[PDB]
């Protein structure tokens, strides 16, 4: 998922936007 | 050294760092 990828794979800033209400 | 993968608790961090007042909901399962 979006949260799990950041560790082994990559996080996206616009996804950071997405995590944020 | 700008972009690193944050694992464990600190993954939540890169968000609240960028998050600010808007804040985030972190999801370890979904």
């Amino acid at each position: 998922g979006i949260v799990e990828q950041c560790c082994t794979s990559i996080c996206s800033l616009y996804q950071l936007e997405n995590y944020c209400n | 050294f700008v972009n690193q993968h944050l694992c464990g608790s600190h993954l939540v961090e890169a968000l609240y760092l960028v998050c600010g007042e808007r804040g985030f909901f972190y999801t370890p399962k979904t």
Side-chain angles (χ1 to χ4, degrees):
Chain A
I2 188 173
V3 149
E4 293 83 49
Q5 269 171 339
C6 318
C7 172
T8 189
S9 339
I10 295 100
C11 233
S12 314
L13 177 63
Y14 194 102
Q15 271 50 114
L16 295 174
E17 183 178 2
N18 249 100
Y19 300 97
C20 295
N21 276 328
Chain B
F1 52 73
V2 60
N3 292 128
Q4 54 184 339
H5 296 112
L6 284 180
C7 296
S9 42
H10 300 291
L11 177 63
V12 140
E13 183 178 2
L15 293 64
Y16 185 64
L17 282 192
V18 189
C19 259
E21 60 170 328
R22 66 176 179 172
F24 66 119
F25 52 99
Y26 173 81
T27 63
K29 294 297 173 192
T30 185

